[PDB]
């Protein structure tokens, strides 16, 4: 089952770019509604 | 004032060209620079 590994490697660099580039504003939006 | 005359002594002979630079961006269908009525000499 090595072939499932290479197909989710663009799936994890999809969210891996979502960490570094916006997510400073996301935790401030997770700071919203006092919870 | 010797410098201030030299600014006018560059602009007076270049004023006939500088309207053809100016009017060619706001006018399209005609050579507006030759559509002028310049004051004649004699």
């Amino acid at each position: 089952d090595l072939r499932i590994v290479v197909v989710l490697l663009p799936l994890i660099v999809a969210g891996g770019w979502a960490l570094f580039k916006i997510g400073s504003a996301a935790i401030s939006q997770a700071q919203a509604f006092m919870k | 004032g010797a410098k201030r005359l030299e600014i006018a002594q560059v602009l007076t002979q270049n004023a006939e060209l500088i309207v053809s630079r100016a009017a060619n961006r706001i006018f399209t269908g005609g050579s507006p620079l030759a559509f002028l009525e310049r004051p004649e000499e004699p």
Partner: protein, 96 residues
Amino acid sequence: GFRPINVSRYGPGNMTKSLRDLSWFLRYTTYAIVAGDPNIIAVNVRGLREIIENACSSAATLVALQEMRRSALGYLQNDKEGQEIALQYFNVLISE
């Protein structure tokens, strides 16, 4: 919202007042440079735009006078000293 106007829609008797003003905008600029004071530019321009608001375009005058200024200071690239004088004086003509 500016478009350049065509001469055929404008009129030859309507534009012969127009094109002599373009020489007249710099003829008084050359008058004010040797006069040493920009008062004559800054007094014959106040409310000229609201005179010619019906006939001429107000947006076409700003873009014409700006590139009249920019092409005139391109002629003063050699002296390096009077170019900042006329940049002060043409900016009176734009801002008034």
